[PDB]
Amino acid sequence: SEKAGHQTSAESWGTGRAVARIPRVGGGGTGRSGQGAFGNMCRGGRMFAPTK
């Protein structure tokens, strides 16, 4: 799916905080808040060169 992985609004937190610069979900109430995304490395992320 061309929208795979990008069904998410996520932006990096940045420096200062001691996590990576990966994009990270924002919110609360669950365990997804803080998880990485928009990446090939991240669980619930896309893949590298999604097969067209």
Binding site: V19, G31, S33, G34
Partner: protein
Amino acid sequence: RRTITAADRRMVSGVTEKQYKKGMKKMQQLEKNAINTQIRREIKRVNFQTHYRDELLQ
């Protein structure tokens, strides 16, 4: 002047007293395992304050 009770009403529909005790134990236990899990899976990415001020420049 009473015939029925909640336990009597549940008598016809399967469960008895001993079986209610037995089922309630395991039900509470499997409700508790989920709390153990959710605590584990939140404890990391709950302490990430969004705009913590870090009161020290000097």
